[PDB]
Ligand binder design. Structure first.
Ligand SMILES: C[C@H]1O[C@H](O[C@H]2[C@H](O)[C@@H](O)[C@@H](O[C@H]3[C@H](O)[C@@H](O)[C@@H](O)O[C@@H]3CO)O[C@@H]2CO)[C@H](O)[C@@H](O)[C@@H]1N[C@H]1C=C(CO)[C@@H](O)[C@H](O)[C@H]1O
Ligand SMILES: [Ca+2]
Ligand SMILES: [Cl-]
Ligand SMILES: [Cl-]
Ligand SMILES: [Mg+2]
Length: 662
């Protein structure tokens, strides 16, 4: 059986001649994915492996478009060809299952659909046999983070030969020697275990499902489907970025009117704890006080921020909070945090309190208080909540039905369901969720638009204490790996880079100032933090103007140019909403450890319109180690027929507002 992308360049052949059912993929008539197995092993049920034959193929196709409530673009086009391939094995130990393939011009998605059948009752998947056999893996290059490690998704990316990527998280991005870029991920991860990729024979990446503590991967009753497995394929690195395949593979919005989900910018009592000017726990340096929160709300009201995150407001942080998962209260504030007073102040100032639920990994203590916690927040005019699950890999703590503690993975079926329960319950309170230490993004924001963002990668916080901090190449790695999954709460915008000293050997963002501004356009998120202490913004008001101006919701986005681990350039057009007319374009560019010159056409600008470019760029002598603050801000009239030369300093960047005139 064969299905092809609409343009014909991606061709998938589904076969039953190998020991198992299998598939392979060519791009422009060169094989990029060799014969790759399909099937399942179960704890008790007989396997779905060899001796299955194709009995039926059903072809259909889609050419439609839909509108996002918020996002990186307003209109999403869905054009694909589809085939459902049915496999059957005769008894004894027979069975049937289908695999549905969707072929887009930018990649392919497939999932298993196992129908109701005799003897398929309570089953436990112990292995998914799905492979991704990369052709010519010995000359391919990969950029990846390890899976099943103690620090979850929070690793810097490795640059290695593909054959050295032994056990990896997704999105898993690599290029072959032809320069074709490929990224493997999944979409609509619901009631199932996350897929890790386990390289078996060289180049053969086998699905490795993150298990329950008991050892099985997925518990199902009767007929079931898997999430989608996704393979993005493009001639250029930016072709991976500019695809909507992850969103297109998710179910449509199930929450109805979601106008109560508000993209915007926020600040927080937050960074001070990370740089040790404040504590989460009580005492003379406690961050979360009524006085401090009101001071931040005043700043937010004056400078155009929608909300103030406050961490450490609830009892349970005293001592070593990493170990306090059992004792956190999610309803009882510290005595110096007056939530009724701050509720009144929120209405006075128009600035909202952003809630915070850190679990330190104990999800049962959170679950038992969750309904009361969200009721308190709804009563308190809180519309967004940041959640947290700080614990080492495999050390989520739950209490089972018999009162016995079990350790689970953040990305097993148990936690996959636990996260979605939190999001769905929050939606009943008109609360949106920003998940730290999350499950990776698989596009579920389409189905549940209050799941607005997540961390799930090393963000700005590792630049306060990472030892080492994020390297100069980190952003240009994220853009082609983590950011392919969906929005990230990176908390950009650190203006004081000197709190630990300058140079290359201290814990600090290893970037220039202009690169911090560029992050607001390079790293998409519907909520963007201005992460620094307010006084540090007041010290640099001209630079701060870009953060005040920049939107977080876009009617269109285009990655114009880039290379994994080297650089990326984004142009985005603001969505018409709130103060934003919908006429301005924005650009952000960042580089890695190397200074880079990038030539950019401005032909993304609307034809026949005049713009005033407000350009924030590295100064002539800027360099991140000892001269990160040199900055030039320039105004220049431009139209779509003009061009720009970006001159990025070492770990530098450029941010531009293209202000539409009249
Ligand atoms: C807050 C942060 O905690 C976790 O990271 C911490 C490590 O678990 C600690 O072992 C500790 O080790 C670092 C050392 O400073 C240094 O010796 C280095 O060599 O190794 C470690 C760096 O990996 O320090 C870390 C921070 O204290 C956890 O992994 C991380 O994701 C947590 N971030 C969330 C927690 C809070 C509180 O709710 C929020 O403020 C953040 O925004 C969250 O993302
Ligand atoms: Ca974190
Ligand atoms: Cl994580
Ligand atoms: Cl960084
Ligand atoms: Mg590089």
């Amino acid at each position: 059986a064969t299905v092809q992308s609409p343009d014909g360049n991606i061709k998938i052949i589904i076969s039953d001649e190998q020991s198992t059912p299998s598939y392979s993929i060519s791009f422009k008539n060169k094989t990029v994915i060799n014969n790759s197995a399909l099937g399942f092993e179960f704890k008790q049920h007989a396997p779905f492996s060899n001796s299955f034959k194709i009995t039926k193929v059903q072809q259909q196709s889609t050419n439609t478009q839909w509108q996002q409530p918020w996002g990186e673009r307003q209109t999403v086009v869905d054009q694909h060809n589809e085939v459902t391939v049915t496999f059957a094995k005769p008894q004894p130990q027979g069975g049937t299952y289908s695999v549905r393939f969707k072929a887009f011009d930018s990649g392919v998605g497939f999932r298993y659909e196992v129908p109701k059948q005799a003897g398929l009752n309570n089953i436990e998947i112990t292995k998914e046999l799905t492979e991704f056999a990369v052709n010519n893996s010995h000359t391919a290059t990969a950029w990846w983070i390890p899976a099943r490690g103690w620090n979850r998704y929070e690793y810097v990316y490795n640059t290695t030969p593909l054959n050295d990527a032994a056990l990896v998280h997704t999105p898993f991005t690599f290029k072959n020697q032809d320069g074709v870029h490929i990224s493997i991920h999944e979409a609509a991860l619901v009631d199932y275990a996350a897929m890790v990729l386990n390289q078996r024979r060289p180049g053969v990446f086998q699905a490795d499902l993150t298990p329950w503590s008991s050892g099985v991967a997925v518990k199902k009753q009767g007929a079931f489907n898997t999430p989608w497995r996704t393979i993005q394929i493009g001639e250029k690195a930016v072709d991976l970025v500019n695809s909507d395949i992850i969103l297109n593979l998710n179910e449509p919005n199930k929450l109805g009117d979601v106008s109560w989900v508000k993209p915007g910018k926020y600040i927080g009592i937050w960074w001070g704890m990370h740089i040790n000017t404040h504590t989460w726990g009580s005492g003379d340096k406690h961050g979360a006080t009524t006085k401090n929160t009101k001071y931040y709300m005043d700043f937010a009201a004056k400078y155009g921020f929608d909300g103030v995150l406050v961490e450490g407001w609830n009892t349970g942080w005293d001592g070593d909070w990493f170990f306090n998962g059992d004792v956190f209260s999610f309803t009882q504030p510290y005595d110096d945090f007056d939530i009724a007073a701050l509720t009144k102040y929120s209405k006075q100032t128009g600035v909202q309190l952003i809630g915070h639920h850190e679990t330190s990994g104990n999800v049962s203590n959170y679950r038992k208080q969750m309904a009361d916690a969200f009721a308190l927040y709804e009563k308190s005019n809180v519309s967004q909540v940041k959640t947290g699950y700080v614990a080492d890999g495999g050390n989520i703590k739950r209490i089972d039905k018999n009162g016995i503690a079990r350790h689970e993975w953040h990305d097993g079926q148990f936690m996959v369901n636990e996260y979605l329960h939190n999001v769905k319950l929050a939606a009943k309170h008109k609360i949106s969720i920003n998940t730290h230490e999350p499950i990776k993004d698989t596009g579920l924001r389409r189905t549940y638009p209050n799941w607005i963002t997540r961390e799930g990668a090393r963000g700005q916080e590792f630049n306060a204490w990472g030892t080492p901090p994020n390297p100069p190449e980190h952003i240009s790695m994220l853009a082609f790996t983590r950011m392919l999954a969906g929005p990230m709460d990176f908390t950009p915008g650190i203006f004081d880079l000197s709190f630990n000293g300058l140079g290359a050997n201290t814990n600090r963002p290893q970037t220039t100032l202009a690169k911090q501004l560029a992050l607001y356009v390079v790293l998409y998120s519907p909520i963007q933090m201005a992460a620094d202490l307010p006084k540090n913004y007041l010290a640099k008001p001209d630079a701060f103007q870009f953060i005040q101006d920049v939107p977080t919701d876009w009617q269109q986005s285009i990655a114009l140019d880039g290379a994994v681990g080297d650089f990326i350039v984004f142009a985005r057009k603001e969505r018409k909403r709130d103060k934003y007319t919908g006429n301005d374009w924005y650009l952000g560019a960042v580089t890695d450890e190397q200074a880079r010159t990038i030539e950019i056409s401005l032909d993304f600008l609307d034809n026949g319109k005049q713009f005033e470019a407000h350009i924030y760029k590295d100064g002539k002598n800027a360099e991140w180690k000892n001269n990160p603050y040199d900055l030039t801000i320039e105004k220049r009239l431009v139209t779509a027929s003009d061009k720009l030369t970006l001159k990025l300093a070492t770990s530098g960047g450029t941010a531009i507002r293209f202000k539409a005139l009249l």
